[PDB]
A paper describes a structure:
Here, we used [name], a cyclic nucleotide-modulated channel from [name], to define a ligand-gating trajectory that includes multiple on-pathway intermediates. cAMP is a poor partial agonist for [name] and depolarization increases [name] activity. CNG channels are tetrameric channels where each subunit consists of a voltage sensing domain (VSD, S1–S4), a pore domain (S5-S6), and a cytosolic cyclic nucleotide binding domain (CNBD) that is linked to the pore domain via a C-linker comprised of four α helices.
Similarly, the sidechain of Arg120, another basic residue on the S4 helix, points into an electronegative pocket formed by Asp61, Ser80, Asp84, and Ser117 on the S2 and S3 helices. Removal of the positive charge of Arg120 would also weaken interactions between S4 and the neighboring helices, facilitating VSD movements in the membrane. The C-linker/CNBD domains of these three states are all in the activated state, with the C-helix in contact with cAMP, the entire C-linker/CNBD assembly translated towards the membrane, rotated by about 12° with respect to the transmembrane region, and expanded radially with respect to the pore axis. We call them open states O1, O2, and O3, with O3 being the most open conformation (O1: 50037 particles, ~5%; O2: 149792 particles, ~14%; O3: 46629 particles, ~5%). The gradual increase of the pore radius from O1 to O2 to O3 is due to different endpoints of the S6 helix transitioning towards the final open state, O3, which suggests that O1 and O2 are on-pathway gating intermediates towards a fully open channel. In all three open conformations of [name] [name], the lower two helical turns of the S4 helix of the VSD are displaced outwards by a small kink at Val118, allowing S5 to move, which creates space for the expansion of S6.
Residue numbers in the entry:
A (entry chain A), B (entry chain D), C (entry chain C), D (entry chain B): 10 to 62, 81 to 125, 132 to 417
The structure:
C-alpha cells in the first residue's frame, strides 16, 4: 500500500522535531536557514488530522512554531513548545498495528530520544561558555548517559542551586527509567523465544526425573530421541492440547487446511465427499512410533483401523519366521476387527520414527453407517 | 460521605508532622511561631481514637510534643519523638479500603518521605557551619538521593567515625530500598495492564505456531481478524472459562444482568416467566461466526435451534441458485430438527462477524416438556 | 528439647570463629589472652561429630588452630586456616530442619559475614600504617560496602598491582553477590505473602472484566461483598479445588478434623456411627448465600436436602403474604423431594451472608439405603 | 568417542584467537615468533568445514590472517580481522548438543571474553606511553571492569573527543550486558534447583493454611512427616499427575521399567505372561499409609484387593483382642470381597510409613475374565 509510507514519513518528521526543537531552544542560531524544511514539515504535520483510516494531533498541529522563535517569546513561556512531541503516544500505539518490537523499539528508541532531550535541557541552564557546540553537546550527552544509566563518575557536577534541583529530578527519573527498562528486558529475555524456553524445560522436568531413576541405555535412547523427533519434525509441540481453545468451526477450518497430507491421496480419502472431511479431521489424532516398536501381539481385542500416511512397515507371522510382506504408503489396514467382529491375526513393528494416525472407534462406526458408498469402499479391500 | 475528608485531612496532618518534626529536631528555631498550627494539629491527632468505623494511634496520641522542645529535653533522649510517624502503617492499610495504588503510592511516596527524613537525620550529625538553611537542605538531600539511589559521585563524603558509621547503615538501607522498589516496579510492569500482556501473548502463541506452519492468505485473514473481533468487541476474552469459579446463584445473577440483550425482545423470550431466565441463561452459550462461513450443508443431523440476536443472514437453496429470503433481528430458526424428528432442508452463510448464541439440546428438550405455553409458542412458528 | 540449645551454641561458636579468625590473621596481637575462650571453643567444636541425630565437620575439627599462630606458620601457607568456616553449609542446611528464613537469614547474614571477611582480607594486603585498629577497620569496611554494593565513591583506590588484582576479583564477586541477592529479594517479595498477592489478583481479573461491562449497583454489591466474605470468613480461598491433591485417607482425616461444626450437634449428625463421617464429610460441600437470595421458586424438581448450620432463614408462602415461620440453627429441611417422590411447596430467602452445606443426591440415596436407623431418623421429621 | 576431543580442541583454538588477535592488533611485536603456532591453528581452523556430522565457519576460514600483519594492511581497514570470532555462535549452539551450562557458561565466559576484547580495544586508541605492557593491560582491564560492571571510581577518564565517543558506546553496551546477565541470573536462581523451590512451596501453602487453622499435635505429626516421607523416599513428587503427558506406549515402557519391584516376586505376578504387565502396570497406582492408620472397619463394601510389596501389617479381630496373625512381604489379601460377593471380616493397621499399591476394581474384573489361569491362581489362595 501507500499509507505505510505516509506513516514512516510522519514518523521521520516527528523524529526530526524531537531532535531539532530542543536544539533550537538552546541554540537560537538555527531556524534561520531551515525555514523551507520547517514550513514543509509543518504543512505535513498539519495535513494528518482527517485521515482516520485525537488530542495529541490537535495539540501538536497548532502553529505555535514559526512564532516562538520569530517573535522570540521569552524563555519562561517558551517551554510550551514541547507539546509537539505528543505524537509519540500515537505512533507507539500505531506501531502495534503495522517481542521484537513491543518492548524493544518502544523502549531503547524512547530511551535514546529522552536522553537527547534531557541532555539538551541540561545544556540549557548552564553559564554561557566559549566552546564549540559539537564538543559541548558530546560533553552534555556524556554527563547525561553517566547519570541516566547509573554509573557515577563525577567529573561533571552541578554548582548552582537551580542545577542541583534539576539534577535531583533527573537523577530520580533517569534511575527509574534505567531500572524499569533493564528489569523489563531481563524479565522479557526469560520470556523471549518462549518456544525453546518453555519446551526445553518440558524436556528438562521429564528427563530429570527419569534420570533420577535409572533407565536402560536402549530406553534412554528413544526417550531423548522421541523428544528429538518432536523437536525437529514438530519443534517441541503436541497439537490437540493447544487446539481446544480455537472454536469448533475454526478447528474445522484449521484442521482441513493443515491435515491436507493424509486426505485425497489414498483411495479411501479421495472422492469421499465433504461431510467426512469436516466430521473426522478433528477426530484425526496423530501418534508417533519409534523403530522396532510393538503395537499388537497376536489376537487381541479393540484393534482399530490403522491409517499409514508415510513410511514402510513389515508384517510377519505370530513368530519371527515366515515373512509375509511390506505395507507402505497409499494404503491402510486394521479394519477386519470391527466389521467382521472377529479376533485378529497380525504382528506389527516399525522401521524408524514413523507417523501414524490413530482415531477412535465409536465415531467411526457411527459415521460408516450413514455412508453406504465408503463403507463399501472399505469393504472390497476388506474382502479382497 | 464526610469521613473520607477526615481521612485525607488526618493524612495531611501526618505528612505535616513527617516533614516538620525532623526539621524541628535539626532546627530549634521553629515551633515558636507554629504553636497555633501545632496545637490544632495535636488536638486533631488526639481526636481520632474512638472512630472505629490501635497501638500506633495510642503511641502517637500521647502529648510528648509541646514538651520535647519546650523543656528542651536533651538530644540523646529526644529521639523518641519519632514514634508519632507510626500512623503510616494505619494509613497504608486503610489506603486499600478507599496496581495504580497498591505498590505505586505506597512505594514512591514512602521513598520520598524516607528520603526527606534521612536527609534531615544526616544533617543532624554535622559540625555547625555558617550557610543558609535552604541551600544546606538542598545539599543534604542531594547527597542523600545520591547514596540512596546508588549513583556515587563522592563530592560529599563522611569525615568523622560516627558519620562513617551512619553512612554504613544508610548505604545498606538505601541500596536495599532502591533495589526493592525498582525490582518490584520492574516485576509489576510485567504484570501491569495484565489484559494486554496476558491476551497479546495468547495471540502470540497461536499465531506463532500457525505461522510456523503455512496457512492461506484468505485463512490468515479471519484468524487474526477473529482475534481482532475478540479484541474489539470482547477485548481479548472468552466468557465461560472464567465464570465457573463464580458461584451458581452468582452465575444466575451476573448472567441475568449481563445477557439482557438476547432476552425480552424476541417474542419467545418476552413474557416467558422467570424460571427460564434463571435456568437457561447460564446455558446460553455464545459463539462468533465470520463472513461467508458454513454451518450446515443440506440435511445433516443434530441441527439445534439457532437464536440470532443481531445481524442479517441469507438463506438459499441446496445449490447457489434460487435465493429464498433474508433472516434478521427479532426472530429465530433451527427448530424443526428435534420437534418434528425429521431431516433438514437449509443452507446458511454469514454476511460479517456475526454473533450467534448456541445452547445445548438435552436441556432444551428437558425444559420444554415442563412448559406447555412456550413450547406452543415455538410451535406456531414451527407450523406456520 | 535440649539439642536446639546445642545447635544455637555451636552456631554462636561458628560466628565467633568467622568474626575472630580473620582478625587474628590480620592482627597477631590477639590469641594471647583469648586462649581459654579458644580452647573451650575448640573442644566444643570437636565434640560434635558423633551426634548424627560429614566432610565439613571433619575438616573443621582438625586442630590446625593453636598451632597456626603459635608456631607462627608463615603467611603464604596460613591461608588454609579458613577451612574452619565450612560449617556454614551444614548450619544453612539444618536451618530448614528447625519465606521468612529460607532466603532471608541465609542471604543477608551471609552477606554481612562475607563483607566482614573480605574487609579483613582487604586490610591484609595494605602497607603497615600508624592508625588505630578500630578506625582502620571502619575505613576498610566502608570501602568494602562501597564496592560490594556497587556505589563507587572512589575516595579509597588501589595503588599496588597486587591490590589492583584483588580489587578485580572482589569487584566481580561483590557485584555478583549484590545483584544475586537483590534480584532474589525482588522476585521473592512478588512471591512474599503469596495469599494476598495471588488472591487479590484473583479478585482483580474478575472485577476488571465485570467493570469492563456495566453492572447494577445492587449487583456491584454482593460481588465485591461476596469476595469480602470470602476474604474475611475464608481469607481468599475456596476449599475443594485445593484438597484433591491430598490423599483419600487424608481427605478423610483432614475433613473429619475440620468439619467438626456441622456434625454431632444436630440430632441427625450425633449418634450416627462412624461410617457416615468418613463417607459423607468429603461429599459435604459448602456454599455461601447472600442476603435476600432465591434458591427455589414454588414446585421445582431436584430439591436436595438443605442442612443449615448457623443462621436464621424465613419461610413464606408462594406469594409474599402469609408468613409461615423461622427456620434456624440445629435443624434441617429439603427432604420430602426424593423420599416422597413429590413436587415441592417452599420459598426460601436469606437474611445475611449465610453458610449452607450442599451435598449431592445420588450418594445420599445410595447410603441411606444401607442405614435403616438414620433413614428412619430422617423419616420422623419428614412425617411429623 | 573422538569427535568431542576435536570440538574441545577447536574451542581452545577459538579461545586462543579471541585472546591473541586483539593483542596482535594492539601489539605488532607479536606474530613473529608465533608463526608455527599460527600456521597450525590456521590449518586446524580451515580443516573443519566438511564435518557436518555454515556462514560463520566460511567467513572465519578465509586466510585473511598471515596477511593482515605481514603486508601490514593499515589500521582503518584492519578491523575486518574480527570476523574470525563468529565461531562463538556455532560453539554456543553446539554446547547444548554435548541450568548448569545453558545460561551459566554461555554468559560468564562470554562476559570475560568480551571484557578482554573491549579492554584491548580501549587500549588501542590511547597515546603511545612508556610503560610495561603487563601493567598497562592490568590498568586497562581495571578501567574496563570498572565501567562494564557499573562501579564508577573515575581515576581513569577519557580526554580526547574520540575516546569520549568510545566511552559513550562502551558505557551503554557494558551496562546493558551487566544488567542483562545479572537480572538473568537473579531470575534463574529463583528457578535453579526447581525441585526444592517448587516442592518446598507446595509444602508451604498447605502447611500455611493448616497452621492458620489449629490441628492436634498427633495430627501435626504425620502431615509434615508424610511430606518428609514424600521428600526422602519420593523426593517431593507424586507420579501420575506428571506421567499423563508421556504417551501411552511410553507409559507402558516407562512403567514396566520402573515398577519392576512389585512384579515377578509374588507368585501372582511371576510367570503371568506379558499382556498383564502392559495392561495393569499403568493402572498400578501407589499410595502411602502411616503408622497405626485404619483402612476398613469390620464389614464394609468395596474392599478391593490389597497388594503389599514391602512391610509387615498385623491383622486382628473386630475388637482389639485375639490377635490373628502377621501379613508381610511376598503375599497379598483383599480378594474375597468381589469374587465371593460377600461382606468382609477384617481389620487392618500399619506399623510404619508403609507403601501399598491400590488399583481399581472394574478393570480388575474385566481382565480376570479373559484369563482362566491367573484367576485360578487367585482362586486357590482365596479358597485355602
Ligand atoms: N497375504 C498377506 N500378506 C501380507 N499382509 C496381508 C495379507 N493379507 C492381508 N494382509 C494385511 O494384514 C493385515 C492384518 O489384519 P488387518 O485387519 O490389520 O488387515 C490385514 C491386511 O491388510
Ligand atoms: N419460504 C421460506 N423462505 C425462507 N426461509 C424459510 C421459508 N420457510 C421456512 N424458512 C426458514 O428456513 C429455516 C430452515 O429450517 P429451520 O428448521 O432452520 O427453520 C426454517 C425457517 O425458519
Ligand atoms: N407449618 C410449617 N411452617 C413452616 N415451615 C414448615 C411447616 N411445615 C413444614 N415446614 C418446612 O418447610 C419445608 C418445605 O419443604 P421441605 O421438604 O424443604 O421441608 C419443609 C419443612 O421443614
Ligand atoms: N486364620 C487367619 N489368620 C490371619 N489372617 C487370615 C486368616 N485367614 C485369612 N486371613 C487373611 O485375612 C484377610 C481378610 O480378608 P481378605 O479378603 O482381605 O483376605 C483375608 C486373608 O488373606
Amino acid at each position: 500500500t501507500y499509507t505505510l509510507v505516509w506513516k514512516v514519513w510522519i514518523l521521520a518528521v516527528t523524529l526530526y522535531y524531537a531532535i531539532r526543537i530542543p536544539l533550537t531552544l538552546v541554540f537560537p542560531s538555527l531556524f534561520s536557514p531551515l525555514l523551507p524544511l520547517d514550513i514543509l514539515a509543518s504543512l505535513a504535520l498539519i495535513a494528518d488530522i482527517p485521515l482516520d483510516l485525537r488530542l495529541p494531533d490537535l495539540l501538536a498541529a497548532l502553529p505555535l512554531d514559526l512564532l516562538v522563535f520569530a517573535l522570540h517569546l521569552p524563555s519562561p513561556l517558551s517551554l510550551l513548545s514541547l507539546v509537539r512531541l505528543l505524537k509519540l503516544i500515537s505512533v507507539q500505539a500505531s506501531a502495534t498495528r503495522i517481542p521484537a518490537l513491543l518492548r524493544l523499539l518502544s523502549l531503547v528508541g524512547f530511551i535514546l530520544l529522552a536522553a537527547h532531550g534531557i541532555a539538551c535541557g541540561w545544556m540549557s541552564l548552564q553559564p554561557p561558555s566559549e566552546n564549540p557546540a559539537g564538543t559541548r553537546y558530546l560533553s552534555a550527552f556524556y554527563w547525561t548517559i553517566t547519570t541516566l544509566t547509573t554509573i557515577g563518575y563525577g567529573d561533571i557536577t552541578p554548582s548552582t542551586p537551580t542545577q542541583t534541583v534539576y539534577t535531583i529530578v533527573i537523577e530520580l527519573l533517569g534511575a527509574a527509567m534505567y531500572g524499569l527498562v533493564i528489569g523489563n528486558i531481563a524479565s522479557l529475555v526469560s520470556k523471549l523465544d518462549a518456544a525453546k524456553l518453555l519446551h526445553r524445560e518440558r524436556v528438562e522436568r521429564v528427563t530429570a526425573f527419569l534420570s533420577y531413576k535409572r533407565i536402560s541405555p536402549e530406553l534412554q535412547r528413544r526417550i531423548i530421541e522421541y523428544f528429538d523427533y518432536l523437536w525437529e519434525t514438530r519443534r517441541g509441540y503436541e497439537e490437540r492440547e493447544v487446539l481446544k481453545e480455537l472454536p469448533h468451526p475454526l478447528r474445522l477450518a484449521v484442521a482441513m487446511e493443515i491435515h491436507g497430507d493424509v486426505i485425497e491421496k489414498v483411495p479411501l480419502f479421495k472422492g469421499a465427499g465433504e461431510e467426512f472431511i469436516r466430521d473426522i479431521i478433528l477426530h484425526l489424532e496423530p501418534v508417533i512410533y519409534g523403530p522396532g516398536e510393538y503395537i499388537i501381539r497376536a489376537g487381541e481385542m479393540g484393534s482399530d483401523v490403522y491409517f499409514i500416511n508415510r513410511g514402510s512397515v513389515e508384517v510377519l507371522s505370530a513368530d519371527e519366521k515366515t515373512r509375509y510382506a511390506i505395507l507402505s504408503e497409499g494404503q491402510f489396514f486394521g479394519e477386519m476387527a470391527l466389521i467382521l467382529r472377529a479376533p485378529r491375526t497380525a504382528t506389527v513393528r516399525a522401521r524408524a520414527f514413523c507417523d501414524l494416525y490413530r482415531l477412535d472407534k465409536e465415531t467411526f462406526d457411527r459415521i460408516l453407517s450413514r455412508y453406504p458408498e465408503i463403507a463399501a469402499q472399505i469393504q472390497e479391500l476388506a474382502v479382497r
